[PDB]
């Protein structure tokens, strides 16, 4: 049976960074579609893009640095082939921002800061190589710690609704996850916002919490209708707070009234039913 | 129905630190019982000790440092009362070792290293206060990054089978999770070992993977017999690799033959059945 984790959203984690969920929100009116690569697990558990099954892989990079280039591997130590997705599994998916990664090694001391600019030509995570940017030689495992305004183009401010250019220019098939659109019908996408550390009120959006991804991947729901109508139940009282709908590509949408930013975070998404994709939602509230 | 995540162990995470699982092993012969506080979720989903439901809280501390003491809060920002367990939820559970924590802030830059000695008198996480050890004033969220040999008693080497002295001296009830023992019958406890970064081959043992904890917490299995016989199935082939048994306090035990360190990590613990606690196991192999 298809099921979503019966845990409060306050207790789950974002799927694009290892962080607690702080809000449920919608996208700014300038952003129609988003193309996140992490946090992309269809309702039948088929992980697409660079989404791992556990949070111990989310926003983590492992590889061997030559002093000039980090040859990326998978996090298990084995080599990476462009065959899987746009980058090694769990690769950070934050566009319009500079990454900052805490790097450690098995067998050594002394964690080290790794500042990553995702615009330059040498950032080609599809060819299994990112720029070292001063990280010394050796095998490293790093996790995303905090983000910053991008270095290029200077003057632009953080837009976490984009994804980094994964290289893989004209000829190759990029294995990028397909864009997800608002299913039209006066319906807007719903994003789980987690507070990212960074010089500003950074609310990182993810399409599904990570525990949701692991539950869908471990469950592998055989049956998917056109969409899955959800309610956001408040566990202390048991009153429905507003209906959402999950589309099979693994996102939730809702029609706000002016909502979803007005909903609490201590609720629980209970899978209500299987609905058609034309099914009309009641506004949030 | 009681179910364990149908994901390979290589893809799950340790419950005492945010790390991938690398092996399945047993305890040294000098260690009979272990008293881990993280990674303690009974088979009916009752989280005990300082175990959180998501990995976004495991081995994380949040609090306000006065320059001399970190007044610990819960990770959601709300104050901490000794009422829950021995320390705030998700507090690190690594005994016999010095912690090292990467600390960040919402709204600021510049991650900072926080070195924690768990022996001194001012390390009283039950009273909601640990030593600042140079961490500047302010509200911080930190995650465990790497470990080290303890500073006291000097000369002792890493023994990850202990837990830190959580303060809470003679009078108070410490809310410590009860010790878990080998149930006898020649059975020995089985530990999921993850490689911790640190100046040595640190294999951190946990009783259950974190995704197991979240699945048991979200599922809340109503029915628990005396024990749950498990098999460790290899997913590519489908051959059982050796039987374990899960006791209701949330651990697995097995009789080695000389095993469980000989088993691969790409298998999947499938809950086989409900057995009595006297049920005799076949040796690993």
């Amino acid at each position: 049976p298809f099921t979503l984790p019966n845990l409060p959203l306050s207790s789950l984690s974002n799927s694009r960074a290892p962080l607690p969920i702080s809000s449920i929100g919608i996208s700014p009116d300038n952003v129609q579609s988003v193309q996140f690569q992490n946090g992309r697990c269809t309702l039948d558990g088929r992980l697409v893009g660079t989404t791992p099954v556990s949070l111990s892989h989310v926003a983590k990079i492992r590889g061997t640095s030559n002093g000039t280039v980090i040859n990326l591997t998978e996090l298990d130590g084995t080599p990476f082939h462009p065959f899987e997705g746009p980058a090694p599994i769990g690769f950070p998916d934050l566009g319009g921002c500079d990454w900052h990664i805490n790097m450690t090694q098995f067998g050594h001391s002394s964690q080290t800061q790794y500042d990553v600019d995702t615009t330059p030509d040498t950032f080609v995570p599809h060819l299994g190589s990112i720029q070292a940017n001063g990280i010394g030689s050796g095998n490293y495992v790093g996790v995303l710690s905090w983000i910053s305004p991008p270095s290029h183009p200077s003057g632009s401010q953080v837009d976490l609704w984009k994804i980094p250019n994964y290289g893989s220019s004209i000829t190759e098939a990029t294995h990028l996850a397909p864009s997800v659109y608002p299913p039209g019908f006066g319906e807007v996408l719903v994003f789980f916002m987690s507070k990212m550390p960074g010089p500003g009120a950074y609310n990182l959006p993810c399409l599904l919490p990570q525990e949701y991804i692991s539950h869908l991947a471990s469950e592998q729901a055989p049956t998917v209708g056109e969409a899955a109508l959800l309610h956001y139940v408040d566990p202390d009282t048991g009153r429905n707070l507003g209906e959402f709908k999950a589309y099979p590509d693994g996102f939730l949408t809702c029609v706000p009234n002016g909502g979803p930013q007005q909903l609490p975070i201590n609720g629980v998404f209970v899978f209500v039913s299987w609905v058609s994709r034309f099914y009309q939602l009641k506004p949030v509230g | 129905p009681f179910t364990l995540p149908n994901l390979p162990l290589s893809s799950l995470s340790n419950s005492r630190a945010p790390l991938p699982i690398s092996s399945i092993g047993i305890s040294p012969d000098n260690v009979q019982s272990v008293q881990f506080q993280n990674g303690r979720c009974t088979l009916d989903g009752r989280l005990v000790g300082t175990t959180p439901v998501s990995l976004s809280h495991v081995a994380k501390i949040r609090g306000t440092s006065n320059g001399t003491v970190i007044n610990l809060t819960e990770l959601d920002g709300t104050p901490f009362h000794p009422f829950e367990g021995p320390a705030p939820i998700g507090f690190p559970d690594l005994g016999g070792c010095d912690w090292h924590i990467n600390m960040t802030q919402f709204g600021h830059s510049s991650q900072t290293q926080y070195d924690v000695d768990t022996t001194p008198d001012t390390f009283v996480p039950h009273l909601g206060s640990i030593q600042a050890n140079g961490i500047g004033s302010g509200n911080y969220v930190g995650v465990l990054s790497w470990i080290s040999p303890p500073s006291h008693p000097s000369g002792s080497q890493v023994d990850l089978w202990k837990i830190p002295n959580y303060g809470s001296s003679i009078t108070e009830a410490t809310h410590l999770a009860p010790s878990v023992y080998p149930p006898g019958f020649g059975e020995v406890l089985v530990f999921f070992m993850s490689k911790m970064p640190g100046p040595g081959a640190y294999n951190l043992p946990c009783l259950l993977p974190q995704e197991y904890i979240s699945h048991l917490a979200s599922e809340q299995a109503p029915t628990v017999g005396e024990a749950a016989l498990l098999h460790y199935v290899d997913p590519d082939t489908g051959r059982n690799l050796g039987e374990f048994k899960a006791y209701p306090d949330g651990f697995l035990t097995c009789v080695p033959n000389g095993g469980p360190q000989q088993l691969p990590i790409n298998g999947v613990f499938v809950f086989v059945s409900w057995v009595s606690r006297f049920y005799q196991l076949k040796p690993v192999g």
Partner: antibody
Framework: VQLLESGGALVHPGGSLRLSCAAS????????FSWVRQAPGKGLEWVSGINPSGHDTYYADSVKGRFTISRDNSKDTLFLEMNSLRAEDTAQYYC???????????????????????????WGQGTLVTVSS | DIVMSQSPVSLPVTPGEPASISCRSSQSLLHSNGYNYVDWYLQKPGQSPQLLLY???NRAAGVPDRFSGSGSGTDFTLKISRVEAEDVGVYYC?????????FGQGTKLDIK
């Protein structure tokens, strides 16, 4: 992925030897391995192979019944013992790790994907076994 | 079992000019999944074999885009778009469909 092999030495025809391949830098427990050999001046020839659990071992017809492949998951080691050697087995022996693909969804998804695929991504440097008198 | 013949035994090429190494299998290497379970290995002079291509056309870790896999069914072509000096060596087409994994006699790609 580093795979270091050792044990190759001159063996009397009919003697025995034991070649070990110690692995470092990756989860050894979840990787399939294979022993391949290159005769001096000839092409590559695949000798044997072993799965992660070590219960499935495959042998070439020229060495079936005389070579034994096994693995110690604890010490991260792969083993090939050789009994009743012949001069035909004079060759350099490599331990190669078969390609792996990240989890990516489960067995409903992965049984239509080419994940077995036989291909050897990482190789060791081989140890030379000369069988002579 | 599967015998993998190759052509030619030696392929003399000039640096920069695209080279085609054919490999023909006695059995069809087209699997039901649509992938050709044929790998292309490069053993350079004095080194251990390294995987260039796997599953017909896919490139391994660190393989530049000049190596291409073409062909299907039973006959496959390693196409080197711009032969460099780093590519000299013996190219083996290994069947990966079934054990015993049989390698081809190899083509000694040499540059003019």
């Amino acid at each position: 992925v580093q795979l270091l092999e050792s044990g190759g030495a001159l063996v009397h025809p009919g003697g025995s030897l034991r070649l070990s391949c110690a692995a470092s830098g990756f989860t050894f427990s979840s990787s399939s391995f294979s022993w391949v050999r290159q005769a001096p001046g000839k092409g590559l020839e695949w000798v044997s192979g072993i799965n992660p659990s070590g219960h499935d071992t495959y042998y070439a017809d020229s060495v079936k019944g005389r070579f034994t492949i096994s693995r110690d998951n604890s010490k991260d080691t792969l083993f090939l013992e050789m009994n009743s050697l012949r001069a035909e087995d004079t060759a350099q022996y490599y331990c190669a790790k078969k390609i792996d693909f990240p989890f990516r969804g489960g067995r409903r998804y992965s049984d239509s994907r080419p994940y077995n695929t036989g291909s050897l991504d990482s190789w060791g440097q081989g140890t030379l076994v000369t069988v002579s008198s | 079992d599967i015998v993998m013949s190759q052509s030619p035994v030696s392929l003399p090429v000039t640096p920069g000019e695209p080279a085609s190494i054919s490999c023909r299998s006695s059995q069809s290497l087209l699997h039901s999944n649509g992938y050709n379970y044929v790998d292309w290995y490069l053993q350079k002079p004095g080194q251990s074999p390294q995987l260039l291509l796997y599953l017909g056309s896919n490139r391994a870790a660190g393989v530049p885009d000049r190596f291409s896999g073409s062909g299907s069914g039973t006959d496959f072509t390693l196409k080197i778009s711009r032969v460099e000096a780093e590519d000299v060596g013996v190219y083996y087409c290994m069947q990966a469909l079934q054990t015993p994994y049989t390698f081809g006699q190899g083509t000694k790609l040499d540059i003019k």
